[PDB]
């Protein structure tokens, strides 16, 4: 929903002794919204045209399932899901 709490956190980092009004925080929040839409809309336009295969951690995981047998795949899939989650 809103970026407000994060905007605020950033704010306290750069200007710890300065606050921000409601209308002001609402402008900040739209601004990040509007940039998120612009960058996303454009990225998808770039993604959509590109026809080439991409290997993502989903393709690697399915691979580990298909090639590591039994106990080895279960545990492998834990160690990697754990590593790409942090």
């Amino acid at each position: 929903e809103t970026y407000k709490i994060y905007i605020f956190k950033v704010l306290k980092q750069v200007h710890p002794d300065i606050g921000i009004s409601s209308k002001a925080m609402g402008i900040m929040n739209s601004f990040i919204n509007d940039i998120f839409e612009k960058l996303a809309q454009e990225s998808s336009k770039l993604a959509r045209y590109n026809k080439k295969p991409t290997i993502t951690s989903r393709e690697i995981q399915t691979a580990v399932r298909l090639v590591l047998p039994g106990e080895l795949a279960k545990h492998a899939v834990s160690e990697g899901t754990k590593a790409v989650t942090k």
């Binding site: 951690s57 989903r58 995981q61 399915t62 399932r65 279960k74 545990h75 899939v77 834990s78 899901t81 754990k82 790409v84 989650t85």
Partner: peptide, 10 residues
């Protein structure tokens, strides 16, 4: 499949 987090080990 996704990268679902129901695949961890306690």
């Amino acid at each position: 499949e996704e990268d679902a987090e129901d695949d961890n080990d306690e």
